[PDB]
Amino acid sequence: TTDPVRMYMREMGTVELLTREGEIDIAKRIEDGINQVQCSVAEYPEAITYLLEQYNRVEAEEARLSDLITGFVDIDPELAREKFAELRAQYVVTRDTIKHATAQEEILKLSEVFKQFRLVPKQFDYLVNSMRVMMDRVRTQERLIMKLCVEQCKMPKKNFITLFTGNETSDTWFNAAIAMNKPWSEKLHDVSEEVHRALQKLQQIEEETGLTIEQVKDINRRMSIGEAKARRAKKEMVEANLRLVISIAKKYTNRGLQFLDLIQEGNIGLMKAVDKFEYRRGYKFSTYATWWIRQAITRSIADQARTIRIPVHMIETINKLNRISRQMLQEMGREPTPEELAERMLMPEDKIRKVLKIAKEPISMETPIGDDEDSHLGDFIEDTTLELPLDSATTESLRAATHDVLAGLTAREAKVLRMRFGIDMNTDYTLEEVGKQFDVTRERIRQIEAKALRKLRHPSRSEVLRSFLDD
């Protein structure tokens, strides 16, 4: 075959299905990966300082209680007051005791109370991005301090990593390589400003993230592994239950939308139903995924069907009206009355006619007209924009008639008329507008205009213009 629908219809026959084993087997893998990435945040003082600001603002009317947490692994509103002071049992035992020997085995018990508060993915993603931005900030300094010595001073990469691995904090390593007398040593005094001050944005991070420059790398080093596990699992999940999406999508044939469009818009909802699914509840995955798949198909139809896009609500309401008219064909015998569905529906009466009036579909201009000839609809379509030439001639004639007539009046009245009206001039002028540059204002012009319109109202000077009026 050729059609790209065949490439897909037989692209899923590769990954075998997954039922009763697959689901619960790889869901555990998903959670085991997110657990690796979750404890990566357990040691991040910036997360504590950021949690305080968004926590106290909840009691000050900015952020909802159930908007920042999905629950605690430990819907009860009373389970809150009991876990806001009992978790600080390790808060101040390791921070002010750096004054850092016994502050190495007392960091796990402080981070343990940080994995019992399930935050909403909205802020959770901000936390993940926070660690990412911290890694990029720390790394910018390394890719600075490195190329300032290797690519410029021509020093071996290994003499750089050997002197850098372990410190990454102070300048004890840079100024110590000056005594090596190597060919690159004599070129280290010039870059002593792009590497010394470089630690101002690198070493300072330590006093912000409360951790050595190297630990900031360890955290993300394992976090990436966890997120990779999660990705590799979810892709297999959707590949396995892919056929279900087609099973659901084949229920929408003539929906103003191609088949593949539907199956794809349904695969999107499949992914969404996957990411928000817990294998713990026991309920099979086929029941849950179907909701998001079928909805991401239905609403998608409501959004890509009509050439004139319509808000979702209207689609729902119109389809309901159609349903009521359908289930009443057998009752009334032929079809319901116009003002009948007004009561059967929750909506009022007079909205039916408008809802049905806008429900028309555009006809392809290529729809062949009667006689079945090659003549199409787009051939009988007129053009009511261009004015016929029979009127353009009248315009070019009135222009000259008005010109001659106005040139028959006085000079003052002439300019006053060509001013109050946009005659042979850009944008006509108001009363005081004319009076502004005609030396007498506000009623002079109001008299001049009436006088001139009266000297033209009189015949023997209006016949020419008067003929242009025919009613």
Partner: protein, 50 residues
């Protein structure tokens, strides 16, 4: 156009806000009216001739 506005000011001939539809007999044929029907939509009250 301003040239027309000058006319509307001179002879005081205000312009209607309405266009014209006017089912008029096709040019080339002349006949006699033998039947006139009127179909009004439901709800909208009928006119006199209706």
């Amino acid at each position: 156009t301003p040239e027309e506005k000058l006319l509307r000011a001179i002879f005081g001939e205000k312009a209607s806000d309405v266009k014209d539809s006017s089912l008029r007999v096709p040019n080339g044929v002349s006949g006699t009216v033998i039947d006139v029907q009127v179909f009004t939509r439901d709800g909208v009250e009928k006119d006199k001739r209706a």
